[model samples]
Target: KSEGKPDKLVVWENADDGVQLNNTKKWAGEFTKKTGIQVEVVPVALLKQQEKLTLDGPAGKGADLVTWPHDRLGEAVTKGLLQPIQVDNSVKNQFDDVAMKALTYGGKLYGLPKAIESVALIYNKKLMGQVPATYDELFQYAKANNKPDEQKYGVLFEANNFYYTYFLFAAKGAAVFKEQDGTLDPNEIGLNSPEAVQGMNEVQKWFTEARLPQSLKADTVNGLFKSGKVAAVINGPWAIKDYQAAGINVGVAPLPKIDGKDAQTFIGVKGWYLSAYSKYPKYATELMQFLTSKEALASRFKETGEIPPQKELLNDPMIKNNPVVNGFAKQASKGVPMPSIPEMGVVWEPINNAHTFVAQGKQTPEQALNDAVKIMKEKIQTMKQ
Candidate 1:
């Protein structure tokens, strides 16, 4: 008999949130029965998980495989956290181009994305009565009927911080970062564009003006929407379970525009990345491939109620069978996963400052975005020199 397995992989995963992914034992058992690889999946809570990796990497105690996002991938890899991956175009072909691009940094693939998630329009039906697809319509309806004291208002969004990115770009047909002809120059910051400013102003007006609901407050502003008190709010997929648990039949739709242009959502794709620092890298990469394959992903999809990144699986009965996820999966196709580049993280703070200036009645929406761009320029520049 075998005392040791040749290609066993120890996977780093999260303990909370995902119901099935936490139970890697189920999939590990399956993987072993099929491939005889004898995978070991380890789940840890968020804070401890990252802390463990930070502590372990120095001691050479890293997992053969790690689950993480694009933000972590860049520096983690530069710090030697992950090994290079060679992907199959068939798998690549099944994903959106943006997801693939996120995995590629300086022309190398480090991880395989298992699912794409983003922020979109989530509305409360009973309090608002009906969901309006467009921002203008929702505002007009709120002005005529809603009263803030009644625990009902037009729209609720997080303007106090980075949450504004979703609607900021959605205000017009725009995005946080778009590559022009192939170079990654953010000077093309769309925030200062007239169209984007106008949309943001409308969002700001909702908070500062006497007409709309207050800016997003952590006191369950989103939760209140689920409780049938607030009207329409833009939230992400993670909130779905809470809404369902609260007994609300919520609807997830693409954001609407001030102009006739279509709306876009802010997104981030999550995946399994192998640490280059590991003793068994091939085992780690193979583990990434196996977890994202048909079996593991299917099991996660069934247990978590979240959508899978595999396009082919959209047709799979296990995933497409649910009504909620069917719409979410469709909406995910059009989302802009949060820019994973390290510099992209720098833009959020300045962007929110501008959004807050407008929200607090400290400045007009135009002024807010304009000032935001100015601050962004200074910060981005400071990073360089």
Candidate 2:
């Protein structure tokens, strides 16, 4: 053993909706049994995680690996706090298309994917027979199936900051910044286009007309959907069990466009990265690879209902036969990874407030998008340096 065996490596992860630290412990046990790696996990509440990491990383006392969302990666890479990973061809083959894109930046792999997900249309089978393949269909379906008095409504989405940016991108609308060949151009195409404005309007109008009051609260999307108070919501599979537990008969499917094309979602991944500044790079890389393999994936999928990022595990018998959550890897293959550029942090809030203002009826969609776009442009400019 090198230096009396490499000690337990601790990873810091989220204590939030999707990351469910308790489930991770099960995966860790399986990992130890299979790999004999002395690894530890620390799941913190989302609010305090970044602050703790920020303080610990520079002191060289941070986690050897971390669980990260796309936004966190963009900002973390910008601060020169992340380690670049060198993946062999076999290792690179593990991730699906979207998983690959999200974990890569500056021509280097930063981490392995722990779990992968995409947003799709989720509906109530008992309340509505027809699922929405289009926005117009969703409108008609919601109008037809809605029982406002029963608190059963059309759809639920958090009007919170991050998912709000995705709404613009989902309808073939637009983002405030565009990328070419994976590199972002801050000055280029964005929302506030006539198309995006209309798309934004359609969603807001639907919320105003058909969305449940409980679902409108940013913290309660899962709660309302689980309670069967909403007929449907366009969200990822993260909350499938929550709905199941609440006794709601649920349906999940890909979100196709109103214009008759397939829809896409914004996906994020969590995985391990070798510390760039660590004294023992090889040891770290080896452990990261060992822990992310196909066997590791089997346990993770069984425990958490998460999609496997490893390609070979895509066909594992357990994954193939699972009726309720089987198809996520294929769905994740079709999503668009959010931009990993440092400036993406400047995009979400103002864009989000645009929807909130329109939701609250303070401005027309056009006026709101225009004002928010201008505000975002200024914000992005400040981030350029």
Candidate 3:
């Protein structure tokens, strides 16, 4: 039950996109019109919200609700900056299971998922006649078409970034942490397992045999792809608009299979969080519900191109009919949500560095992975104190 009504409610929205900000403000206006409550929208960088709330919350300066990706859930809860919210099964069942799983920590619901994102194969229509059916086909095309002197490439992606390279491990039955009963066990690290090493060896071939340049980073991939010099790339939905604006006839599809299995990219969920310090927790939760309703999210997708996490909306004509959205949805359905535990924060750097060493031929896949896992274990142990 609510403790009466507050004078107004403050909410934080992502600051990077003007279109998204405008749509959020419009939603706030509609919420106020229906409920006779004043709503204020403050722009804050999505990644910075948790740290900001840690300080502003105690001073009563933080917003009643904040938005950020679910990967940060464990850290936010561990710091006591977020308050868990209750949802009816009728409401909870509307969202995808992976999204719901990502928002939960220690068996408690902490946020309401608003969107889902994962990487997929985005290709150039004129350069590639059809989507490659397997990673081998894609690799063969890459090697056959690569011309480094002319800045041409067959396939390109940010191999050094763990987010893009994670599928290499996942397709071979590798995982970051073990899960049981909806909770993850940080003690069971899987990045250095035998299957994981097998996956990293594939990554090594991309450099050694595919002849991908060591300098092939995100900006290079985007620039090359947009110029129509690259045939395909592993990327997310956010890159579509820029590629279209740059006049590339882009087509999106699920990544080609790896070793006869789907390449499981890392799923990322973004949602609304209730601040632990909110004076009007009940009203704040009501706003979160209103913003994430099926109708509200459908409109959000129409305006912002962010895919809704709701199960019903996934099949809606608005999403299914759009090749770009549908392509990512297909890939996301097979993805493993990035682990949300606090220890996951320490995994990125060491693992990504290991990939770099393997790419440059400085160390074998097994050696680099073993060293990275060792470093991750040591850091995780120190962090527990």
Candidate 4:
């Protein structure tokens, strides 16, 4: 044992998602049983983990490993709060290529990915005979199927939320940064470009027609779909169980094409990072490696609904039999990873507000996008200060 290192290693995990929390606890118990090293699991809210890590790390009070979303890689690395862990070829073979890439920063692996997800079109097969293959086709379907008093619509999504609306904008040419072979250039912001404006123009139809209103939040959208009020909704793996429990015959599919282009959703990878502040880096890496292994990931998949990205597990009967898992994996294959550039922090609010303005019918697409660009630039400048 390393001198001065505690026998127990601390792991800070997000407390917001109950399923993940439960799976983490289950994994920790098994890890203790096998390794004889008791892991100290602390519940840290997702929004607060990053800030706390930056402060606590240098103060020598931080966790040995942390549960983090890949989108925070750039920020964490820049702050020197994460270390690269060596992975053997056998261990490397376990993860999905896309998910593995997301966990890497600057040509180094920073974490071992546990879950990979991207929102896709989840439909009720019994309600809609066949899902529409294109956005225009879905429009026609909505026109025929929608019965407002019955709360039924052709399709539904969180239309006013930028995270989901990103597919529409990105289908054209919009991006948070200029991505070059896995690296992101923070200087380039694509939100208000000509092609991006065109994309936003295409998305405006949903708002103008009142098909997807701002009122259709996460709860209402999922709630409506579970009740058979909507044929389909743009959601991820997390909603699968609830839909099935409600007796909805759910079928998952990649998003419909927008103007002859595939609408690729943004992918998110959740993983465990070895904290730079940790005294027992070796032990921390050992735990991370074990947690993301095939056996551990399989248990996590069974306990939590989060889809595992391990390659061999992909062909497993459990995953192959479940359409939600297999279907989301397909969509994730076509997705772009959420940019991990620290500058991405400045991109969210303005874009989200722009989506709000357009969804509320308060502004034209061009006007909303232009306003967002202006606000985003101002915010970015402030961030520099």
Best by TM-score: 3
Off by over 4 Å in 2: 1-10, 13-50, 147-150, 156-168, 207-215, 219-223, 327-330, 383-385
Candidate 1 vs. true structure, TM-score:
0.85
RMSD in Å for model 4: 2.7
Q: How much is 139 displaced in model 4, in angstroms? A: 2.8
Give lDDT for model 2.
0.67
TM-scores, one per candidate:
0.85, 0.84, 0.96, 0.89
Q: Rate the local accuracy (lDDT) of all candidates.
A: 0.65, 0.67, 0.88, 0.81
Off by over 4 Å in 3: none
Clashes of each: 3, 1, 0, 0
Tens-digit lDDT string for candidate 1 (1-385): 4223556767677777666556566766776788777677777654355457777876877677677666545556555556787767786776667777667665677778777776666766565444576767866765665566776655665646555456555656555565654334656677777777766766665665535433556554665676676666667778787887888777666666545655556656777676666766655566667777766777777776656677677777765555456556656666655665555657788777776676667887777877878877777668542
- Residue 88, candidate 3: Cα error in Å is 0.9
What candidate 1 gets wrong by more than 4 Å, as runs, is 1-7, 46-51, 125-130, 159-165, 170-175, 178-183, 186-188, 208-210, 213-215, 316-321, 381-385
Model 2, span 116-143: residue lDDT tens: 7776667778765666657677767766
Q: Write the per-residue lDDT of candidate 3 for residues 1-385, one digit (tens) a residue.
A: 5488977889899899887788789888899999999999999989889888989999999999898989878888988999998788787898998888888888888888888999999999898878989988988988888777798989888887779989888878888888888888888999899999998988888887777887567888899899999999999988999999999988889999988988889999999999999998888889989988888888888998999889999988888889778899989988888898889999999999999999998999899999999999898989563
Q: Which runs of model 4 end up more than 4 angstroms from their true locations?
A: 1-6, 14-19, 88-90, 245-247, 258-262
Estimate candidate 1's alpha-carbon lDDT, on a 0 to 1 scale: 0.65
